[PDB]
Amino acid sequence: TTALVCDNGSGLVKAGFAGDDAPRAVFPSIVGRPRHDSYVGDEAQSKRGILTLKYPIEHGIITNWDDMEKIWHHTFYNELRVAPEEHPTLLTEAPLNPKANREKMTQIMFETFNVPAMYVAIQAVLSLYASGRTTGIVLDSGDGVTHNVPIYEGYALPHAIMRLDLAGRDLTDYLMKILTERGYSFVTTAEREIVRDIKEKLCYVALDFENEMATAASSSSLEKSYELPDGQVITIGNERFRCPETLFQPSFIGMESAGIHETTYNSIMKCDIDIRKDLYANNVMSGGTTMYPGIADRMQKEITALAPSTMKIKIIAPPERKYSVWIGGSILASLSTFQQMWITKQEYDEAGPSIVHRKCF
Amino acid sequence: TTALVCDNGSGLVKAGFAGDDAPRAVFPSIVGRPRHQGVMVVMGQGDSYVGDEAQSKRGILTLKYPIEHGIITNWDDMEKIWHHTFYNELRVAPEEHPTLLTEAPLNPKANREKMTQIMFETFNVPAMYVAIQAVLSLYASGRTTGIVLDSGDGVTHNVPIYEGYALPHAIMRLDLAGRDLTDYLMKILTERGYSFVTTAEREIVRDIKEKLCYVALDFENEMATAASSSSLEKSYELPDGQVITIGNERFRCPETLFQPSFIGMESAGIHETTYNSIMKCDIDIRKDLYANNVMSGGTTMYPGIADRMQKEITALAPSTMKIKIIAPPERKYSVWIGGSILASLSTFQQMWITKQEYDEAGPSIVHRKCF
Numbered sequence A: 001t002t003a004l005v006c007d008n009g010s011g012l013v014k015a016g017f018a019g020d021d022a023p024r025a026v027f028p029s030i031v032g033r034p035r036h037d038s039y040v041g042d043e044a045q046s047k048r049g050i051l052t053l054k055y056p057i058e059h060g061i062i063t064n065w066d067d068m069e070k071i072w073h074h075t076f077y078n079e080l081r082v083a084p085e086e087h088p089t090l091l092t093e094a095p096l097n098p099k100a101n102r103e104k105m106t107q108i109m110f111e112t113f114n115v116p117a118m119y120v121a122i123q124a125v126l127s128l129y130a131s132g133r134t135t136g137i138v139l140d141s142g143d144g145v146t147h148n149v150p151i152y153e154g155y156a157l158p159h160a161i162m163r164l165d166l167a168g169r170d171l172t173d174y175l176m177k178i179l180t181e182r183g184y185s186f187v188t189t190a191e192r193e194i195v196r197d198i199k200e201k202l203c204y205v206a207l208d209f210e211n212e213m214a215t216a217a218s219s220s221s222l223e224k225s226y227e228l229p230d231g232q233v234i235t236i237g238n239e240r241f242r243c244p245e246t247l248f249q250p251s252f253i254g255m256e257s258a259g260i261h262e263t264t265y266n267s268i269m270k271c272d273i274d275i276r277k278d279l280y281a282n283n284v285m286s287g288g289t290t291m292y293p294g295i296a297d298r299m300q301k302e303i304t305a306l307a308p309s310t311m312k313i314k315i316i317a318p319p320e321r322k323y324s325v326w327i328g329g330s331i332l333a334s335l336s337t338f339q340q341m342w343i344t345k346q347e348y349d350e351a352g353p354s355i356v357h358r359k360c361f
Numbered sequence B: 001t002t003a004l005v006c007d008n009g010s011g012l013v014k015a016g017f018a019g020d021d022a023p024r025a026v027f028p029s030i031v032g033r034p035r036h037q038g039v040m041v042v043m044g045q046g047d048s049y050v051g052d053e054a055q056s057k058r059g060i061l062t063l064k065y066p067i068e069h070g071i072i073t074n075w076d077d078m079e080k081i082w083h084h085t086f087y088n089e090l091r092v093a094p095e096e097h098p099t100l101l102t103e104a105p106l107n108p109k110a111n112r113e114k115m116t117q118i119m120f121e122t123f124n125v126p127a128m129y130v131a132i133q134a135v136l137s138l139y140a141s142g143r144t145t146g147i148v149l150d151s152g153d154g155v156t157h158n159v160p161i162y163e164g165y166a167l168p169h170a171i172m173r174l175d176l177a178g179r180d181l182t183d184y185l186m187k188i189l190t191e192r193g194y195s196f197v198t199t200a201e202r203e204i205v206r207d208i209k210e211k212l213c214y215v216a217l218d219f220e221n222e223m224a225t226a227a228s229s230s231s232l233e234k235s236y237e238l239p240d241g242q243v244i245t246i247g248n249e250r251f252r253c254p255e256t257l258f259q260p261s262f263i264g265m266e267s268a269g270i271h272e273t274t275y276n277s278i279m280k281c282d283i284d285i286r287k288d289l290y291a292n293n294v295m296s297g298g299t300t301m302y303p304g305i306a307d308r309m310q311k312e313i314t315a316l317a318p319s320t321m322k323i324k325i326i327a328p329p330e331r332k333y334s335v336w337i338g339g340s341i342l343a344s345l346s347t348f349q350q351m352w353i354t355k356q357e358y359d360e361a362g363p364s365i366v367h368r369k370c371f
C-alpha cells in the first residue's frame, strides 16, 4: 500500500517511502570489491584500503548493470528494510536516458526484484513539480552531470535539453589542483573526500568575478580557516569562488562548452518563441551543486544580460533543492490519479519492457 | 501526413480530416445482406452493401447495425464499414494517415484492443489513438472539467470529467436514445389511428421526430393546452403526398428522456441520472460540475430540452449554487469536432500510438493514454 521513491544519482542514492517530507536513507552510489564477495554504500567506504570503488551510475546514466542490481538490492533490503515484491517503486532517470537503458531498468525491477508495479520519471521534471510548476526551465547540477531541462505543461522538450558534462565532482578535482599550487598536499581518493567538504562549506559564487578577485590582495576578511581531521589548519584565498566560478567559465578546467548561464539560454532559445516568456519567468535551481551561495543572484544577473531588456526574469532556488528531485518523486507517487499511471507487473508480463515508455506523468 | 478522425456511433459514422469544422463524411452505420440466403447454390455469396449504398435498395436486403448501444458487437461487418469509410467515403489510403477513433465511456478493454489490433493489422495505419466520446464533446465545448450528456441513437451516457479525465465509478449509462424515441413516436401514432412499422417507415417517423417534436418545460401545463387550444403543431407532407397532424405527440415523445415510464424502462430520467452522477462524485468538486453541464448528441437537439434541464435540476440541487447549461449548436457533431481539434495539435504528436510501438507491444499498449 506504500510506494517507494528511489532517486539514484551518479553520486548519491536517495531512497525513501512516498509521502515523506524527505529521503530517509542517503548513501553513496559506490560499489567495492576485493582488490584481487562485494561491499556497498557507507560500509564499502570503511574498507577502501582493500577495495576498488566503482560508481555504477556514470553521468546520470547507468553503465554497470551488475553493480546497480547490488545497489538496489542493498537499497531495499539493507537501507530500507522492506519487501520489494510488496511495494510499488518509482525510479528516477536522467534526461534522455537511452530507450534501451530504461527498458533494462524496468526488466530488472520485475524479473529480478518482483516489484508489484513501477514507474520511471525524469529527475528534472520532478524537481519542477516540487517547486510547484508544470511549465519552466530546470537546472540540475549534481555530482555527475548538469542538465537544463525546459518543460512545457509537464512535457520536457527533448529537442532543447542541454547536457553539460561538468559538475559537483569535477568542481572538487579543480578545488584540489588549485590547492597544490598554493602549496598543500591532497591527491588521493581518500583525500579527495575532504576537498569535497571544504568545497561544500566555504566556496561560493560571486557577482563580479573581478571586483572580487581584486579584493583578494586588498582586504582578507573574505576568507576563513578549516580544521582538517589531521588537526592541521588551512587558510583559503580566492579559491573560495575561483572554484564554483568554473560552472560559468568552463575554461579553468579546460572543458570547452559555455557556462551554465549561457546554456540555460542556448536552450531557452532552442524553444518556440511562444513559451519563452514563461521559461525565463520560471528558472528552477535543482541539485546539490546549485547550493553555493550567490549562485542564485549570480545567475540572475549573468543571464538578464542575454535576455531582452523587456522581460521579467525569475530564478527559483528552493532551500531543499538538494533533495528536490526526491521530494517530487514522493509527492507525485502519493497523488491519487498517479495510481493509474503505475505500470503493473501484469501489464509487464503481457506487453514487456517497451510499455514502460509512454507515460505522461 | 494528415490525421483521420472517425467517430463511430450506434446510428451514424462521422469520418473526416483533422482541422475541419465539420466531418466531411456522415453515413449510416449499417450493412445490407440480401434476405435469408443461408444455403448452398445461388452461389457468389451475393456480397454486401454498406452505407447510403445500402438503403437505396433496402427492399430486398436485411439491415444490421454493427455498433449496439455504442459498443461493437460484430467485428466482421464493422471492418467492412471502416474499409468503406477509408476507400469509398473519405477516398484515401489507410496506410498513409493516422486515425483517431472514438469509443463509448467504459468501452470494454477487450474491444479497444481488438479495435487497435484491426487498425494496425488489416489496415496498416501509421499510428492511431482512441478517445472517449464525451471527453471530446467537452474539449470541443472549450473546457477540461464538467459533466457531459451524450444522448445519441443507441445510448445516453452521462460522463463527469475533471481536468481532462473521466471519472469511471461516477458514470451513468442509460440504454435509451434516439432510435428508442423513434420507435415510441411510432407507437403513439397508431394510437391516434395510423400505420408505420416497416423498417422503411421507421426512417420517416425519425424524420417526423427531428422535424416537429420538442421538449416543453412543464409537462402538464402544455398537455392541458393540448385539450384546450390547438396551436401546438403543424402537418407534414410525406412521399405518399397525403398529410398528417400530431398534437400532444410532438412533446409526449421526448418527454421519455425524463419520464422513461412512458415506454416502461423504469430508469430515473436524464435530469435525474445527471444528478446521481454529480452526487457520486467528490463533494469538493460538485460545484464546478453543475456550472459545466454539456449537451452532446443528436438527441440533445430538441428545442426547449435545454431549459427543461435548467429547470429540472435546479429543483433537485442545493439552492445555494449557480447552475449552467451549455448546449452548443453543433452538439450534433461535437464529438467529432473535439477529436478534430485534438488530432490537429502539436502537443498531441506524442499521444499517437505509432505502429512501431504496436509492433513490439501489441494491443495492450492502447491503454496508456491520459489524453
Ligand SMILES: Nc1ncnc2c1ncn2[C@@H]1O[C@H](COP(=O)(O)OP(=O)(O)OP(=O)(O)O)[C@@H](O)[C@H]1O
Pocket (backbone or CB within 6 Å): A008, A009, A010, A011, A012, A013, A059, A060, A140, A141, A142, A143, A144, A145, A168, A169, A196, A199, A200, A201, A287, A288, A289, A290, A291, A292, A322
Ligand atoms: N551544500 C552544498 N554546496 C555545494 N555543493 C554541494 C552541497 N551539497 C552537495 N553538494 C554537491 O552537489 C553534488 C551532488 O548532488 P546530487 O546529490 O545533486 O547528485 P546525484 O543526484 O547524486 O548525481 P547526479 O546529479 O549526477 O545525478 C555532490 O557531488 C556535492 O559535491
Ligand SMILES: Nc1ncnc2c1ncn2[C@@H]1O[C@H](COP(=O)(O)OP(=O)(O)OP(=O)(O)O)[C@@H](O)[C@H]1O
Pocket (backbone or CB within 6 Å): B008, B009, B010, B011, B012, B013, B069, B070, B150, B151, B152, B153, B154, B155, B156, B177, B178, B179, B182, B206, B209, B210, B211, B296, B297, B298, B299, B300, B301, B302, B332
Ligand atoms: N435535430 C434533431 N432532433 C432530434 N433528434 C435528432 C436530431 N438529429 C439527430 N437526432 C437523433 O439523434 C440520433 C443521433 O445521434 P448521434 O449522431 O448522436 O448518434 P451516434 O453517435 O450515431 O449514436 P450513439 O451516440 O447512440 O452511439 C439520431 O439517430 C436521431 O435519432
Ligand SMILES: C/C1=C/C(=O)O[C@@H]2C[C@@H](CC[C@H](C)/C=C\C=C\CC1)O[C@@](O)([C@@H]1CSC(=O)N1)C2
Pocket (backbone or CB within 6 Å): A011, A012, A028, A029, A030, A045, A143, A168, A169, A170, A172, A189, A192, A193, A196
Ligand atoms: C557526505 C558525502 C556526500 C557525497 O555527495 O558523496 C558522493 C559519493 C562519494 C563516493 C566515494 C567516497 C570515497 C565514499 C563515500 C562517501 C561518503 C559520503 C560523502 O563520491 C563523492 O564524494 C565524489 C568524490 S569528490 C565529489 O565532489 N564527489 C560524492
Ligand SMILES: C/C1=C/C(=O)O[C@@H]2C[C@@H](CC[C@H](C)/C=C\C=C\CC1)O[C@@](O)([C@@H]1CSC(=O)N1)C2
Pocket (backbone or CB within 6 Å): B011, B012, B028, B029, B030, B055, B058, B063, B153, B178, B179, B180, B182, B183, B199, B200, B202, B203, B206
Ligand atoms: C437522416 C438519417 C439519420 C440517422 O441518424 O440515421 C441513423 C442510421 C439509419 C440507418 C437505417 C436506414 C433504413 C438507412 C439509411 C438512413 C439514412 C439517413 C438517416 O437508422 C436510423 O435512422 C435509425 C432508425 S430511427 C432512429 O432513431 N435511428 C439512425
Ligand SMILES: [Ca+2]
Pocket (backbone or CB within 6 Å): A008, A009, A010, A123, A140, A142, A287, A325
Ligand atoms: Ca541527481
Ligand SMILES: [Ca+2]
Pocket (backbone or CB within 6 Å): A024, A025, A026, A027
Ligand atoms: Ca542515511
Ligand SMILES: [Ca+2]
Pocket (backbone or CB within 6 Å): A155, A156, A157, A158, B350
Ligand atoms: Ca514533450
Ligand SMILES: [Ca+2]
Pocket (backbone or CB within 6 Å): B008, B009, B010, B133, B150, B152, B297, B335
Ligand atoms: Ca455518439
Ligand SMILES: [Cl-]
Pocket (backbone or CB within 6 Å): none
Ligand atoms: Cl572518477
Ligand SMILES: [Cl-]
Pocket (backbone or CB within 6 Å): none
Ligand atoms: Cl512563486
Ligand SMILES: [Cl-]
Pocket (backbone or CB within 6 Å): none
Ligand atoms: Cl433495431
